[PDB]
Amino acid sequence: VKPNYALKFTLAGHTKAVSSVKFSPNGEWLASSSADKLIKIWGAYDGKFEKTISGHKLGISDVAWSSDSNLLVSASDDKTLKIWDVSSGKCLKTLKGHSNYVFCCNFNPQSNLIVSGSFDESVRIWDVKTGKCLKTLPAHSDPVSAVHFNRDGSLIVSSSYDGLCRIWDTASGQCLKTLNPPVSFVKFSPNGKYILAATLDNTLKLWDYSKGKCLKTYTGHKNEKYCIFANFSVTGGKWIVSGSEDNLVYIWNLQTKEIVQKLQGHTDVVISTACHPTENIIASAALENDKTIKLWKSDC
Ligand SMILES: CCCCc1nc(CO)c[nH]1
């Protein structure tokens, strides 16, 4: 069994490198962030441009949705995160505290908290309602490449160029576990038992969190430079999805570790991929020679 992702839409409009694409939890929208300082909202199913959300003074490296699909958070080189009302496009809160570029962000499942990672080497936990910083974790000794909450928000996982992945107790801010090439991306599996980690030696690893053991390795792609997003595809077959510095989207069989598809079409590094929550749909986005988002559809 292999997927058969085919190109459905090319989304043009960002004037510099795209940095991150994320599907709304309700499956309706794609949000994109860019070095052009803009967030753009697109129809997930028809690829139709919806709106531009603006206000950051420098490039945006990441964007994330609240669980109810009503809010976005963005992470910017202007050293702030911003919370946006998607319907109005208005900035509700500017989260101030990082002393350098904010690189990565995510809401917890409740969406009362935001976690951020920065070049300042810290992870911050923010109150969504007040916009106040609740905790500053001295998480790493180099830029923080990724931050993600587990399924119930009890844990945070962070990755860094220092070569560490760390698991934090959300409530206390205390480090429960440390798992050395730079770690360029990390996220929990949907069930929260595993962590998917990218290292800048062209390697993805599936870690059993509780055991601290490497279960799977995915190779064949190019990743020596950029913090490329990877995903668990769960809507059809159980795949691993990642961009690559050879301008392709890679899809592996999670269990066998075999490459089952490579998606051709991008004309620069595929920095970000996202899996639709209910349909067999991938969004991919590329750096400044390309600046487009592609939507792909598969039968499985
Ligand atoms: C400038 C390109 C940034 C892309 C990016 N990758 C991640 C992984 O967490 C966050 N942002």
Numbering used by the authors: 31 to 209, 214 to 334
Task: Recite the paper's sentences.
A “cellular multitasker” with many binding partners, the scaffolding protein WDR5 is best studied in the context of histone methylation as part of the SET1/MLL (mixed-lineage leukemia) complexes. WDR5 comprises a 7-bladed β-propeller fold, each blade composed of a four-stranded antiparallel β-sheet (the WD40 motif). Cavities on each face, namely, the “WDR5-binding motif” (WBM) and “WDR5-interacting” (WIN) sites, are the interfaces key to its scaffolding role. The WIN site is dominated by a conserved arginine pocket, where the guanidine headgroup sits in a “phenylalanine clamp” composed of Phe133 and Phe263.
Of the hits from this screen, one compound [(2-butyl-1H-imidazol-5-yl)methanol] was chosen as the most promising to advance. Compound 1 was determined to bind in the WIN site, the imidazole ring stacking between F133 and F263 (the “phenylalanine clamp”), thus occupying a similar space to the key arginine of the WIN motif. The nitrogen atoms of the imidazole mimic the arginine headgroup, donating hydrogen bonds to the backbone of S91 and C261, while the hydroxyl moiety projects deeper into the pocket, hydrogen bonding directly to S175 and via a water molecule to V177. The butyl tail is oriented out of the pocket, thereby picking up additional hydrophobic interactions to S49, F133, and I305. The protein in the WDR5/1 complex displayed strong electron density from residue K32. A truncated WDR5 construct (32–334) was therefore expressed and used in crystallization. Compound 1 was identified as a highly ligand efficient hit that binds the phenylalanine clamp of the WIN site, approximating the arginine headgroup of the WIN motif.
